[PDB]
Design a protein around this ligand. Structure first.
Ligand code: NAG
Ligand code: NAG
Ligand code: CU
Length: 235
């Protein structure tokens, strides 16, 4: 159970975004139903009053929390991958609109899941704003927690993969549009029971064999990381 507090831009906190620039749900409960419209932007998908201004090449950082800011972030049991998608705001996340800008599952070297390191980074992970057409966008951050993913929610509704999904309203102002945004996948839609990554046993199978759900990351992506870029105690 985890939620988004806000975002930083080039290492500068934009302040609390909850129900302001984030289309926040009422609580930190996971989405589990792969055919639910909750898969798009979670349970309360509506326009919020603000959109964060960025320019192509900026670092956009998501800051997650559990109950209060800079807490335990998310339970350690929730080992799993982390991804970020983008889509034009006008779609409302409907249709084949979601392009992937980031994927992190398991780092072989450190023997750490993305989630594990998100805790160490005080809830912070980032992406670099790609050179797309100026305008309004939704950035969809998605954490998959695999601790009950040896079962499927369709077969057993009290188990299965857990999605923590947060959509942020972002206005790209300055971009040459040299990497115009391609076609994407649908949410709900891109993940099914058969999709690699959805069903997995993290207690028996080695993490080095885990394959995260497609699609793959777009060439137009300029990269990102899981790592603290800002100190919230300084505020
Ligand atoms: C999952 O969501 C779909 C679409 O909203 C709905 O038909 C179905 O009732 C849901 N399944 C469960 C078990 O809640
Ligand atoms: C691995 O762990 C060390 C600390 O134990 C950290 O300094 C290093 O950045 C980690 N490597 C990554 C994030 O790939
Ligand atoms: Cu949880």
């Amino acid at each position: 159970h985890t939620l988004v507090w806000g975002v930083w831009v080039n290492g500068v906190d934009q302040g609390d975004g909850r129900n302001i620039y984030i289309r926040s749900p009422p609580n930190n409960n996971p989405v589990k139903n792969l055919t639910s419209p909750d898969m798009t932007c979670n349970v309360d998908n509506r326009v919020v009053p603000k959109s964060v201004p960025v320019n192509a090449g900026d670092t956009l950082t998501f800051e997650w929390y559990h109950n209060t800011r800079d807490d335990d972030i998310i339970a350690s049991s929730h080992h799993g991958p982390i991804a970020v998608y983008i889509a034009p705001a006008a779609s409302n996340g409907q249709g084949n609109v979601w392009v992937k800008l980031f994927e992190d599952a398991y780092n072989v070297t450190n023997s750490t899941w993305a989630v594990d390191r998100l805790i160490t980074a005080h809830g912070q992970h980032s992406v670099v704003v790609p050179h797309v057409a100026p305008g309004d966008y939704l950035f969809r951050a998605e954490i998959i927690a695999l601790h009950e993913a040896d079962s499927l929610y369709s077969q057993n509704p009290i188990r299965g993969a857990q999605f923590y999904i947060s959509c942020a309203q972002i206005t790209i102002n300055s971009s040459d549009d040299s990497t115009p945004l391609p076609a994407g996948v649908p949410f709900p839609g891109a993940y099914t029971d058969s999709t690699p990554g959805i069903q997995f046993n993290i207690y028996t199978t080695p993490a080095t064999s885990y394959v995260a759900p497609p699609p793959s990351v777009w060439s137009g992506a300029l990269g990102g990381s899981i790592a603290q870029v800002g100190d919230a105690s300084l505020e």
